[PDB]
Symmetry: D2
Subunit: 137 residues, 4 copies
Amino acid sequence: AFEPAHLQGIWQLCHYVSENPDIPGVLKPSNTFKVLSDDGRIVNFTIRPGTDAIITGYGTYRQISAAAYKESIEKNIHLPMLDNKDNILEFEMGAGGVMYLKYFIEKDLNGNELNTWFHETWKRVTMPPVFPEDIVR
Amino acid sequence: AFEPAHLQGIWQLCHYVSENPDIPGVLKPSNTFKVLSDDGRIVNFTIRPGTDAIITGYGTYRQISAAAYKESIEKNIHLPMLDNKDNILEFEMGAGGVMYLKYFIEKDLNGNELNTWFHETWKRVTMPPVFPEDIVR
Amino acid sequence: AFEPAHLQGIWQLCHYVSENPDIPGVLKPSNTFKVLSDDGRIVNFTIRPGTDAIITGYGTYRQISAAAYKESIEKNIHLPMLDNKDNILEFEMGAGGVMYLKYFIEKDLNGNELNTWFHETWKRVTMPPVFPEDIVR
Amino acid sequence: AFEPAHLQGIWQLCHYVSENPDIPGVLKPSNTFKVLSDDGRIVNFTIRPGTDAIITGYGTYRQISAAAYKESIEKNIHLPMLDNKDNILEFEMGAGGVMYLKYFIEKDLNGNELNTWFHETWKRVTMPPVFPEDIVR
């Protein structure tokens, strides 16, 4: 028995950036989005400036404990070793709409031992007060 | 009785672009996305390269006839005259995943006469065969 | 005898954009730059978001009359029929730093008759009052 | 006596990027360009996707030793403490067209102690074999 978390929404992948590799990267929003629907569907897609955005992964999802949810992946071109497999995302909600995710993958695409944790940082997409001027739809 | 159309998906706004305004614009994908969920929710959002993407409109939707669907808008910062109102989108599916939409707006935000048809072109976002090299997630 | 025009600078290519192809496109800045140096060198380059920008053309240039200048092109991957050839750009300076250019090309890459005028719109890149916040260098 | 370095060209600012801040950032090209002309002029400018690019700094430059060059800055909106001042850029040329720069700034804009070294990584912009398909000029 756990309280449902606020997973449903549109989430933007972030990354860490620095002009100097000796200075810790600062968090910046990037080009990938995860849609967690109210009806238990998950889709990841990546924008490609100047051309068509692409779906990179899809399946279903449900929260499984207080601090984790499961994605049941049908196909994933970013991480094809997850095709037709479950992946457990351990999550931590931070400030300003940030969600820190980690997930473990046992084997690589060829079935060899991988046993690695992967980390991602996401930020909830929300509606601002006004539609900005000089924005290109 | 009408058959349900394939509205559900993620749709990318397109525009028509030319270097020379005397030469008909070519269709190119842009920075806005419409999520039409399986459970009747609609969200529009616009990416802003270099910074956070923004939700620009949301509500519910349902198909109302063979060639039209309705968005029941809660809030829309792109078109605030549509807040807490319905908008009927007449649609036509074309080739290559393209959907042409048009909709009429009677009044502007202040209640003055507007009586304008607006036209949009959208393209269904799909999964390609492989995750491309030199893509920035 | 003609007065020298203000050609020297960094110029950004613009294009015409519309969400509705029946509405004349509005002028918007795009991804290509032309550097007209003080010492008579010309270089065109095109940015490719997410990856390396590319030089697309280079050579030398000089003004030849009140309303035209000549580019002496060494190599041009955008218009390879101009390799090791001169091209005369007829120019008209507009408002807000806009420069309208046109040029005639007699033959295509294979030597067949082309006899076509091409039109471009450019805008002078200048320094604003302040470095904007939320800009990504 | 030192041999002249290959400073002249168009240079693209790079940064180091990772999804997971524990994994060393990978070098990626960004949105700023430095034009080092054959006639000793320097201009920095930053592209702003969707809108007008901006000049961020300009002046003159000359190589002063085997491993350093000086920028004599007129105005710089990125680093306004450098207005009407010199800045010495220590440089190292690497592989694949990369140039590493570092420079010291003694005081901040108000004249208080800053005494900071700044590090930048730049990549020479070159002409590829063919003009790519699906590129937006």
